[model samples]
Target: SGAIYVGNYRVVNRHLATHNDWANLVWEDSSRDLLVSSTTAQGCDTIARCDCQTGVYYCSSRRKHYPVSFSKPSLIFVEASEYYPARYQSHLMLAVGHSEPGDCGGILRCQHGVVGIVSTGGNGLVGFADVRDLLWLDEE
Candidate 1:
């Protein structure tokens, strides 16, 4: 297992995807990322490996570090990035609330399955990439 730096945090057991900007990280003591809760998505190809589904809704996340508790029930909404507000070609799944640099690469899960990955943030919100866009892992 190995670790990589994501927005100033160390994510262990990082497995990168073959085609998209997606990755899996196994939990570790010093992990700065949040661990995703298990959930099955609709029309998933395989039951065993495809747990995180893609959609926007209210959801919770697990923070392994610190107090070891769940994050406030947050809303996962789809919107264009604030930096490029007029861009329809690209869309971001934004969540309500503040986030720190350690949140990068973290999971954002809804009732059905995973909605996206933590990508960017500010005082009142954070942006993420849809988990449905995640591809298979690339061979090392």
Candidate 2:
């Protein structure tokens, strides 16, 4: 339903402990209070929410606006985010890619998460080259 922004992720200790919402979401390191995903963290003892200043979808450590859709099938951080709606939560519509203003999907459990909203409205899961064919970004 929402989107992501590149930065650090925080796992709510209570949510992780009580499953109030599967550690609900993550946020920018020392940024405004905002939302990076769904509002599951809300409950009898809900999680938290965020503002548009922070609740916007930005980028990630590596920018793969769309996921790796073929062989190897290695998941980007978005997959982890997508997994939440599909696995950890009651909802199943995911945002495993970024789609900007007209987006449709997005997320990750952090588990260390951000970026790449995987917007269904965009080319979600349809871009990028083979990781196996590329060199590591830090290779000397």
Candidate 3:
């Protein structure tokens, strides 16, 4: 192994149950009052809405929708997690920078219960590294 650069990290502040978006993401219900769009990407519009087919309020999107339950912490707040995450909800909870550029990469497509990512082929994952702007759902 070479050398791993350790950046400035500290346990700031975070909530266990409730959360507020530091990015100020405007959540809008598409059809029913249950549909809350999580993915800011196009093509694969990831949504967290009520599944009439399942009768359970699942919070997942297209390329990643299945179900995790809800009103199960629907508000997907994005900010660097202050403390170490012990739950599966915050996998890379280490450097979770919200006011960063990944927002346009569809990488921060996180929801409370059932979240998802809308990457077709290889977007922010790879291939389009220099063109990460293509990962977002922009009409421009």
Candidate 4:
């Protein structure tokens, strides 16, 4: 079998998920809402900081529809999480907010640009990582 490398990863430093935590990521091409046309990226510079004041949005398939749901992004506020710290070296950043679980892999975008991806959720808050950490940008 021939398998090409199409994934990105880095070593985990501190303790992983605590409890009742989960992650879900959808393929960019497969997802109807996250298609390139719907969202735009500007390298790693466009990533948003984990500030509680800044507004962000991401779409999820939490609510089921008759045939299919045209998932739309929902507004959310985020803040730095003590458990999930920003690991710039590994490009992994963590934050928590009042988001649903199905939002994992959801694009956390702001008016500026794309910031993070829905990674995990616990209790009433959700965990996410900086987009720069997972995506490989252009090399000049």
In the range 46-139, model 4's lDDT, one tens digit per residue, is 4433333344545465432111111123333333355334332222333444445445555555554555555545564544444433344212
> Could you tell me the TM-score of candidate 2?
0.18
Q: What is the C-alpha lDDT profile of model 1 across 1-140, one tens digit per residue?
A: 11223222332212222222133332321121222221122222211123332333222333441111223323433334432342332234554655655555555554444444555566767655443333221111
Clashing residue pair totals per candidate (backbone < 3 A): 1, 19, 1, 1
How many collisions between residues are there in candidate 2? 19
**Model 2 ranges with Cα > 4 A deviation:** 5-105, 121-140
Candidate number with the higher TM-score (1 or 3): 1
Worst 10 residues of 3 by lDDT: 1-10
The pairs that clash in candidate 3 are 59-114
Sort all candidates by TM-score, best to worst.
4, 1, 2, 3
Model 2 scores a C-alpha lDDT of 0.26
Error of 2 at 75 (Å): 16
lDDT by residue for model 2 over 1-140, one digit each (tens)? 33322222222211112243334533221111122323422322111221111222323423433332222223333222321332222111233344443233233221112222223223553211111111121121
Per-candidate TM-scores read 0.36, 0.18, 0.16, 0.36
Residue 37 accuracy (lDDT) in model 3: 22
- Is candidate 1 or 2 superior in TM-score? 1
Write down the lDDT of every candidate, Cα atoms only. 0.36, 0.26, 0.21, 0.35
C-alpha lDDT of candidate 1 relative to the true structure: 0.36
Tell me how far the alpha carbon of residue 114 in candidate 3 is from the true structure, in angstroms, after superposition.
6.3
